[PDB]
């Protein structure tokens, strides 16, 4: 009756991976990149090192950490009231996939380079 995805079992918030078998929503994407900041910084080679404190695992679960994650995630599904009819929101995975692949973030399952894809 009240299933998630509608009649066609839509899924406009998940991204598939070419390697292994593991998918996650865009909500967990923000936390994954922030946690694995040491690997990204060393890959390329103070103002640059500004998000170092956010790498803490316990800080994210605190009141301050909860607000930081929500600030970056703008909830693209929500929009203006006039966006009705043909002007409906589409899957925002196109932008997320580009950043996740360019940043060269390892997958939790298996340590690999950019292997993410839209799905």
């Amino acid at each position: 009756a009240r299933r998630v995805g509608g009649i066609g079992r839509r899924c406009f918030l998940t991204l598939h991976c070419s390697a292994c078998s593991f998918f996650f929503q865009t909500s967990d994407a923000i936390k994954l990149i922030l946690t694995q900041q040491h690997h990204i910084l060393r890959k390329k080679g103070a103002s640059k090192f500004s998000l170092l404190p956010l790498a803490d695992a316990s800080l994210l679960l605190k009141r301050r950490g909860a607000l930081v994650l929500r600030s970056l995630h703008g909830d693209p599904l929500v929009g203006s009231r006039r966006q009705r009819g043909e002007f409906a929101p589409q899957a925002p995975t196109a932008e997320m996939a580009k950043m996740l692949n360019k940043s060269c973030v390892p997958c939790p399952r298996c340590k690999r380079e950019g292997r993410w894809e839209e799905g």
Binding site: R2, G6, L13, L77, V78, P89
Partner: peptide, 26 residues
């Protein structure tokens, strides 16, 4: 979307797009 009719429509619409929003009150 001020009343319970139009406001609840937004939450139900997002539920069909592959998201889970708490429902519960309002």
């Amino acid at each position: 979307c001020m009343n319970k009719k139009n406001r609840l429509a937004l939450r139900k619409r997002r539920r069909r797009m592959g998201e889970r929003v708490s429902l519960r009150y309002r």
